Every structure is written in C-alpha cells, then in structure tokens.
Ligand binder design. Structure first.
Ligand SMILES: [Zn+2]
Lengths: 135, 51, 134, 120, 102, 86, 59, 50
RNA sequence: CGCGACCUCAGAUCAGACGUGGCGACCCGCUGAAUUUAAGCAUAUUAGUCAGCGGAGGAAAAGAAACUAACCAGGAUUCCCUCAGUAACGGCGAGUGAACAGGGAAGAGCCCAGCGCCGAAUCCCCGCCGCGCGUCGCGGCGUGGGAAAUGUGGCGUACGG
RNA sequence: CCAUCUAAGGCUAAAUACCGGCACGAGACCGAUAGUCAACAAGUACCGUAAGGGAAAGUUGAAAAGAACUUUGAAGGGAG
RNA sequence: CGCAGGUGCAGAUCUUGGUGGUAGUAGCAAAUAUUCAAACGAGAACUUUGAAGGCCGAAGUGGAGAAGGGUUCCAUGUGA
RNA sequence: CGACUCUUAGCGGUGGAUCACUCGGCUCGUGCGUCGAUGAAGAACGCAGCUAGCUGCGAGAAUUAAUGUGAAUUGCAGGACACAUUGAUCAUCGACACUUCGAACGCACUUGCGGCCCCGGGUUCCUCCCGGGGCUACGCCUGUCUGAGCGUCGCU
C-alpha cells in the first residue's frame, strides 16, 4: 500500500485524516510500472503492458514501447496515430489500459462520476452556476 | 461591481405588441406628434403615405 | 457612416495612431490642397507637401497672397517652414514659424518622375470614379 | 558603396576592400581620441556600415554556394536544412500523411461518396 | 435567523461558487457562429439536403412518451435489407444506419 | 548585546549572484539558488506567489526568438524564398 | 593601447606587429575599472616609440 | 577588497559607467520629459545589490 | 581443445535519428489541508477545494454499449434546456445530491489480436539507372545487407466472417 | 423465468472550454488619492541575507515667440 | 419627461496629502586647548603658510594589511 | 497713542483641492491559436560622433541585405542622397548575421584544466611554443563494428 509521507506519522488536523498505515494508491501497481518505463525512455511511446511474474515483495511487468520516429512505424498508416504529438506520455495522463482502469469511466449507472469525460469534468459541470442573460 | 449583475430584461410578447400598437396609434394624432417637437406643419396628412 | 468592422472610430486609438505614426504615414497626413489653377490642370485635389514647393498661407497670422518656398518639412513636429513666414527672437535672429500643411495652398509643385507618377495615379483613379457614377 | 555593385566581384577583391575599410576605421578611431575634426567623427558611422555591407555580401555568397553544393544530397548541414519550428519538423511529411491501407483504398473505390438531391 | 412564517430554504452557496460562474454574454456570438457554420456546410454539400441523412421513425421508450414518435439514429439492418439497400451504400446515398437497433 | 553591537559582526555573505537568474540568491554553502533553484534542471516556481511569477515570466525580457516567431507566423513560416527582384 | 578584453599578450603582440610593422619586446596588461583592457607595449630597441607614434598619428 | 573576481569587477565597471549625469542636449529634444538622472547612486548613501 | 552457430549481455567521439527545458488561462493523471458552518465539537461541511507533483494540444479528455430501460421500447461520445434542489446521502442535524426518459447543438464511424487461407506474399537500410524533384516520392535491378516462422503482409472482427 | 449487452486490446472530426499568447472591435465603466501596483526612464527607485516587499510622480503657451539689451549686487536675487 | 447608480460625512486611536500652536522653544555640554601674524579671497573664529602653547606617548590619535566598501584614490574647477 | 490679541474684507504668500482634458486602465466580444539541442524562456555584458536611463540591437551591435515607398533625419554637427548611370527616410521583412551564461553539452564554474584530428606562423614532421578551425554531455531507438559467458549446442 501507500504509507503517508508524514514525519513521525503526525498528520496535523482532524482525526478523520489521521490515517498513515492502511492507505491505498488510486492507481494500480501496473500503472506505476508503465509510468517508470515512459519517464526513463522519454523518446519512446508506451503502448501497453502485461503481467509476467510476482513475488512477496515485487511485482513484475513488461511494457511495450514504440519508437515513433522509426520509418517502419510512420510509414504504416495503421500505426501512425502513435506518432502524433497528442500521444506523448499516455502513461502519465492515464490513457493506457492500466491507467484508464483507475479513472472510473464507463457506461451506465455504475459510472456517473465521470459522465462528462473525467471526474474533474463532471465535478466542474455540476458545480458551475449558470447565469443566463435573461434570468 | 460584478459582471453577473442582471443586465437584461425580458418583456412578455403580448405586452411588447401592445406597446407597438399604442405607439402606432399615437403617431396618427397630430397633437401628440407636435408634442414631440416634430414640426408637422404644411404636411398634408399626418398618416403620411407615399407611393 | 463607417461600416467596416475593422476600422476604429475610437478617439484614443485614432489619436494614438496619428501621434506616433511612422514617417512615411506622416507624409500623407501632411497633405495640402492644390490651387484652383493646379486642380484644373491636373485632375487632383490635394498632394502631400514636399520641400521646394511654392505655397501661400490661407489661415493664421501670416495669411496673405504672398508665394513662398517650402524650406523644411519637419514631419516629427507636423509643421512646414516657408521662406517669409518668420519672426524675430529677443536676441534679434530670425526663426521660421511652423505652419500645418492643411493651412497652405500649393501654387507650384516641384516636378519629377515620382511626382508625375502619383499625379497621374490620382487623376486616373478619380476619372474612373466619375465614369462609374455616370 | 553599394551592395549591388559588390555582387559582380571575386572573393579576393572583396577581401581587399574589407581590409581597406578596417584600416580606415582604425585611423578614424585614432582621430576620435586625439580631438579630430567633426567631419572625421561622422565618417565612423559611414565606414562601419560599409564593413557590414561587404561582410554581408561575402557571407551571402558563401552560404548560397553551400546551398548549391548540398542540393540533392541526402544529408545537409543543420544550418542549411529548413528551420520552421521544432514541432513542424517532427510532424509527418505530406506523402506519409496521405498513405492509405489497402483496406481503406478498397472502401473508397467500392463505396464512394455520391452526389445526390431530394426533390420537394 | 428565522423570523415568523417562512420557508426553510437550503441554498447551495457554501462551496466558493464565485470562482465558477458561467455568464452568457457570448450567447448571441455563438448563435451567429453556429449559423454561419450551417450556411457554409450547406454550400459545401450544396446539392445534398444540408439537414443530414434521412432518419427513421422511432417510438419513445416509456409510458409517459410511448404515444409519440420521433426521429431515430439510423435505419436498422433489418429494414435496410427488406428495402434492398446495401448497408455500405446507404451512407453514400444519404441513409443513416444504426447497426445496433432491433 | 543583540542589536547595534551584533550588527558590527556582519561581514560575511550568505548569497552571491546567480548564473541563471541573476539575483543575489545563490547560497554558497548549499550551492543552490533560493530564487530559481539553479542546479536543479527545472526553475523554481510556485502558485502561492502570483507576484513572483509575473516578475520573471515570458515577456519580461527581450524575447529575442519569440518576437520573430510571432512575425514569421503571420506568413506561414516561409523560408528559402525572396521577394521578386526589381 | 586599449585592446579587447578577450585578448592575451601573445595576440596583442602579434596584432601590434601586424598592423604597425614593428617589433615588440614585451607586453603588460591591465583591466581598468571602466572595463576595458589596457596594454603597455614596449618596443624593441631598434624601433623608436616617438617615430611610431607619429606614423600612427597619436602625436 | 583588493582581492576580487573578474565577474565582480565587470559588475562594478558597469555601475560605474552608468552613474553619469544626463547630457545637456537631451533637454532640447522634441517631446523630452527627462530633467535629471533619477537613478544616480552615491557610494556612501546607497549600497549595491552585490 | 580449436573453429563455427544461436542465446543473453557489454563497449564505442561508430552511421543516422529522437527525449529533456519554458509557458501554462482552458485540459488530463495523482496527491491533498485547515480557516469556515454546525451558534460548542470529534462524523459531517468547507472539499477531492487551496497549496504540492507530473503530462500535453490548439483544444484536451471522452467515445462507437459487458448501455438505458421494462416501454407500442430506445441506440457512440461531447455540450445546452429540463428532469431537479428531485430519488438518495446526512451526529437523518447543519448540510449535501446525481441519473434515465423528453426537446435541442453537432453528428461518422472504424481497426486489430484470436480462428483460418495464401511458397514471408511483408518491412528497414544501402547503392545504380529511368524519372520526378522547394528542399523528397515512384519503377526496376542488385551473383546488395538486415528484421521477421518466438509470425511481417493481404483477406477478415460480432452489424457475423 | 425473462430482458439486455459481449469486459479484461486499439484509433476517430464536429458541436464544448479558454483570467496565458498574437492581432482586432466595442462600452449607460474610471477619469491621475479613481481606473491595473504601474497614463510618466514601473515591477522602476528604494528596502530585506534571502524567500519576498514595492512606491510617489500627468497639464507653460496656438506657436518658445523660453525675456536680447541697460542697471545694482560676488552671486542667488531684483529694477527697467 | 423618463432610465441607472461605485450618489450626499465631523467623527470610525478612519486612509492619503497638506498645515499649525508648542517655538525661534528643547537642544547643537563624553575623551585637558588654543593664540599671534600673513596669504588667497566679495566675504575668514573654522582654509593654507609661518611662529608659539598643548595632546595621542610605540597594547598610539603612528606606519601597513585581511573581510567589507567600489572609485570613496589623484589633479583642476564650483560653491546651487 | 502705540504694541499685542480677535473678527471681517482686499492684496500677497508655506499649499495643491476643484473644474476641464487623457497616446492609460477595466470589462465584454471576435478571429487566430505559433516556443526549444537548427539551442527556447530568462539572465549577463557590450554596441550611437556627442547618449546616462527607457528603447532597439549582438563584434556586420540605435543595425547589413531585399522589397514597397519616394525626399528626408533633426537637439547640435558632419556628409550622403547630383531626388535615374535607380534612391534619404520610413514601413515590411522571405536573405545574411546573431557575444557570455542558461534544459546547457569536453571536465569544472575560477575568464581554471584537458584530449583527438587538421591549418598558419617560429623550428622543422620535438609536434616543442604561439594563433586559428572541427569534434569531445546524459538517456534512448534502428542498424554497424569489436567483444564476454564452466548459457545451449555442432564439427572437431
Ligand atoms: Zn538563480
């Protein structure tokens, strides 16, 4: 899990925010594997990742990367999308398959917190006061 | 001062049509038109109609 | 009334453009009317003032029928200097009095290839407009 | 001196003219520190701008010759290959942008968009 | 706070609403821009109807609205087949297609 | 003792001029800038100081490259061509 | 002379020799509080500083 | 002190050269608004940022 | 126990490329208080908000149902009106609080992996020639290298093929 | 029992957003103690070791025609 | 005649600026001390030269450096 | 008688209110919507005949070239431009040029110290001295070369 990085375990404030020890990260262990591969290999594009192994202390994943400036990639129309600038660091924006799972998006009644594209998008829409010209 | 002050007013369509009818009726009375300072003399007919 | 949505009628914007206009825009701003005889010869109403132009002053203290020669076009000050339009300082020396070119009338214009070319352009454009109206 | 008159000249005489201008400019700066005439001080601006004019012609001719030499070569110096914007140099060329898969081409040929109207 | 008779009001102004206020002074501007987009699109597809493809007749799915009929997303594969129109040529003709309608 | 007497001992210098931002905020013993965080690759910037950002944002300096880019954008970033000769 | 700040004694000696056709014995260098570099160029015994100064025009 | 670096000396050189009074002909320029150098710095009164 | 092949690794100022930093109003992923209200206060509220971190684009994100509904059924996403201060949550206190249907703005759909058939049909690089040539694509040839059977390409993806 | 869809792979324009940037237009807004801190050599002068803090300050006259010359005073400053 | 407000000040130890009485008042009292003559000069208790009388009394009121200052160093001129 | 004090008015002054003005703001709206290892943003230091600051610029430094324009710039001076054997000024701006730091890039942040390959001058293949030029950062992709392994094997 995620231990809160507070000195001596002292979260100053109200008791509801005193938790230090049984807190959990919002993103999966697979997402942080993709994020660490992308940060090191800045010139590459994270495509996807999968599980390979597991220990009591470590989890092992394998990440697929695409060199977006190789001619075999940007001469093939079926893979020219990864070369577009809007697909830089998908792993850091939660656009890979592992990253999307933590965002809580989908279709139907289980997913209404992200009914406008994201949690922040939905929050902003229902927390903005519409003042028309004719009120 | 804030931009979301109410700047605009909506009037009922029937009342807006009422105001136009009243304005048209008054425009045909020479006393009311002269009371606006519109120098209507030597004008042959106040409801002036030209081809 | 102006209809162009890209032309400003704003006071501050029009004054700002006038007062820090570049030199070549100050040239056309400092235009003066041609004489009645010159307007009859060339079908042109006004020309930008230029050095060695013979003008007469029609407004101000130095108005008259005297013809003088433009000796300086101080575009930064938006004034021109004429031969006889002058006064005396306290010391005794003589200084020119700046006259805005909108207050003078050109009686003879210095003629060269560039001046003939823009005289013909202004006459051709006006003649086209008269024909279009007719 | 005029730039257009310098273009019909060889590199050696352009270098000779540049040398005479620098020698003259050195002489004028001597006059500046020894209380020289106002006519000599005003010539410093003139001679300085001629040196710029000559060096402009030499540099422009040299760059033009390099562009002609590297024309058609697969690899050019970074000084010569076009400078637009880092982002535009990353983007796909016009040819690869219009490349289509055989599946896409079949779709366009078999079911093209049609021009049609509906009567009232 | 309360003074004699009144309504127990619960206004939702406890959440720093002044940072998120949507004013509609650009409403007339977005009507002209939407209108000019329609006119440009109509010219670009000039002979075509400029109102989109033909939509099917659809019944509204609830007791409150099952007496009314509106336009659907597209003609289903079953009605396209009975009419004898290929599902890959309907879009070119100007026929909307909804493969997921029963 | 604290006060005027203690101010007489002020003869050292905790900070020196910085080689990246130019302010006298380069700590000598820590070898780091309190204004821009120079040895760090990213500049020091915070949202709690809106005044601080405005002092050192884009547009406060020459903008040697950016001002030509603004001019060049108006013509499509053309290059390799010259106007027609006389 | 006043010389460029990015100029050492070897460059100063070679330059003075090149444009004035004189031999240099030694060069001493100073940076003034104005910011410019001052060079004290002692000439060879064969050459006379006053004659060189006349030809340059500083006197 | 006498012991100073090149960077500091060049910094002091610039402040020395910019501590001069306004030239007299500037007052005669058309549309002039400067009457004196308001950025004059005295060594004893105001100390340098260094 | 020398010479080969493959595998897994290493070094190179090797030939070509690519990333870093800035701006950050709008956008995406995290992390994340307390002042305040409750006339005290701890849950709650403030608030998934301020501050902190990372990543972009002219938009971003989302997106073509493991959907809604229960009807005589609708039919990707996004936005506006309404639903609605409602269903629901809450020391059921203070307070918080959506969605479906309906009307509009816009409207557009598609692709693999898998299962198969086709003598790897496929791709990168390097030369030469015919070209074309605004700063680079085409055809051939290569008794030219490499990748790829630990699977490239063509057909085909739930609406079936 | 019925209804509905086919997860754990992928791409996609438009309608939507925009207190930064480049150009524009306008206003029942303010009119130099106001309006941006900043109409002016303003994020300047100056202050703090530093993070940071941060001003005051517009108007001769249409045109300098900005008072030549005489006179008292060492001059500032006066009288003509 | 109507329309719309950032629409009326004696107070807020109110904010910014300006000004009084106090008041020609307090004060210009820490470390012994000045005098005569001359020069320059419009002008001298205070500058300079000379002659007297005194002080620091080598852990100095001396001669040099380090930090720090940054042109304060030197010459000439001015006396706002 | 004065003086002094108080009040009022006239005139004169320590003062800068009021009024009039505004190349400034603020707000709304529209169109675009573009930085950077080909070195950005931001700093530093320089550059004018006389020029401190602001501004503009970079050793070609208050600007070169090119195109358009068509007789100025201006505070003083000086000399262009004979105002077509084609051009002052200004604007535009596609050519050229663009010092030192800075993601900052040979190592290091002191005008410190290198290395490899070339060029010129002293001597002559000491590369010994001086000057100049090109390279010399991290990560990472495809390919290339050189390798390692009691890794798996084959021929010996
Ligand atoms: Zn710094």
């Amino acid at each position: 899990g995620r231990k809160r990085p507070v000195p001596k375990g002292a979260t100053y404030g109200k008791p509801v925010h005193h938790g230090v020890n049984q807190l959990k990260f919002a993103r999966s262990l697979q997402s942080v594997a993709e994020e660490r591969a992308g940060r090191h290999c800045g010139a590459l594009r994270v495509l996807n990742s999968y599980w390979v192994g597991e220990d009591s202390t470590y989890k092992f994943f394998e990440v697929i990367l695409i060199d977006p400036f190789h001619k075999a990639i940007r001469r093939n129309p079926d893979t020219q999308w990864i070369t577009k600038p809007v697909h830089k660091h998908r792993e850091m924006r939660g656009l890979t398959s592992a990253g999307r799972k933590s965002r809580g998006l989908g279709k139907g009644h289980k997913f209404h917190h992200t009914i406008g594209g994201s949690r922040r998008a939905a929050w902003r829409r229902r927390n903005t006061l519409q003042l028309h010209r004719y009120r | 001062t804030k931009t979301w002050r109410r700047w605009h007013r909506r009037v009922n369509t029937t009342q807006k049509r009422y105001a136009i009818c009243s304005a048209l009726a008054a425009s045909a009375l020479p006393a009311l038109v002269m009371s606006k300072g519109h120098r209507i003399e030597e004008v042959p007919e106040l409801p002036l109609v030209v081809e | 009334m102006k209809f162009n949505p890209f032309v400003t009628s704003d006071r501050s914007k029009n004054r700002k453009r006038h007062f820090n206009a570049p030199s070549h825009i100050r040239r056309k701003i400092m235009s003066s009317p041609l004489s009645k005889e010159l307007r009859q010869k060339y079908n042109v109403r006004s020309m930008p003032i230029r050095k060695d132009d013979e003008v007469q002053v029609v407004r101000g203290h130095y108005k008259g029928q005297q013809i003088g020669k433009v000796v300086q076009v101080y575009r930064k000050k938006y004034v021109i200097y004429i031969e006889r339009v002058q006064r005396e300082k306290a010391n005794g020396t003589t200084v020119h009095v700046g006259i805005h070119p909108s207050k003078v009338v050109i009686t003879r214009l210095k003629l060269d290839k560039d001046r003939k070319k823009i005289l013909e352009r202004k006459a051709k454009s006006r003649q086209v407009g008269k024909e279009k109206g007719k | 001196i005029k730039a257009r008159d310098l273009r019909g000249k060889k590199k050696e005489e352009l270098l000779k003219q540049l040398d005479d201008l620098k020698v003259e400019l050195s002489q004028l700066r001597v006059a500046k520190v020894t209380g020289g005439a106002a006519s000599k001080l005003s010539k410093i601006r003139v001679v300085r701008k001629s040196i710029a004019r000559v060096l402009t012609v030499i540099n422009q001719t040299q760059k033009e010759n390099l562009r002609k030499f590297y024309k058609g070569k697969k690899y050019k110096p970074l000084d010569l290959r076009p400078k637009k914007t880092r982002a535009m140099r990353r983007r796909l060329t016009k040819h690869e942008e219009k490349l289509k898969t055989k599946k896409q081409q079949r779709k366009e040929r078999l079911y093209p968009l049609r021009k049609y109207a509906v009567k009232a | 706070a309360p003074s004699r008779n009144g309504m127990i009001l619960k206004p939702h102004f406890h959440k720093d609403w002044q940072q998120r206020v949507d004013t509609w002074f650009n409403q007339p501007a977005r009507k002209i821009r939407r209108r000019k987009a329609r006119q440009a699109k109509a010219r670009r597809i000039a002979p075509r109807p400029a109102s989109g493809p033909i939509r099917p007749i659809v019944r509204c799915p609830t007791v409150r609205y099952h007496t009314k009929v509106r336009a659907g997303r597209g003609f289903s594969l079953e009605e396209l087949r009975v009419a004898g129109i290929h599902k890959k040529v309907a879009r070119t003709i100007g026929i909307s297609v909804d493969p997921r309608r029963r | 003792t604290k006060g005027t007497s203690s101010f007489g001992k002020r003869r050292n210098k905790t900070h020196t001029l910085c080689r990246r931002c130019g302010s006298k905020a380069y700590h000598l013993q820590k070898s780091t800038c309190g204004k821009c965080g120079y040895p760090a690759k990213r500049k020091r910037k915070y949202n709690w100081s809106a005044k601080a950002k405005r002092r050192n944002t884009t547009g406060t300096g020459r903008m040697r490259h950016l001002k030509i880019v603004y001019r060049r954008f108006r013509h499509g970033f053309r290059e390799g061509t010259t106007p027609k000769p006389k | 002379f006043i010389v460029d700040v990015k100029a050492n004694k070897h460059q100063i000696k070679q330059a003075v020799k090149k444009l004035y056709d004189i031999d240099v014995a030694k060069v001493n260098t100073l940076i003034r509080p104005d910011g410019e570099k001052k060079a004290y160029v002692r000439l060879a015994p064969d050459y006379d500083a006053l004659d060189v100064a006349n030809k340059i025009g500083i006197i | 002190s006498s012991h100073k670096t090149f960077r500091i000396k060049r910094f002091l050189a610039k402040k020395q050269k910019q501590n001069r009074p306004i030239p007299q002909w500037i007052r005669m320029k058309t549309g002039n608004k400067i009457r004196y150098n308001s950025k004059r710095r005295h060594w004893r009164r105001t100390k340098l940022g260094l």
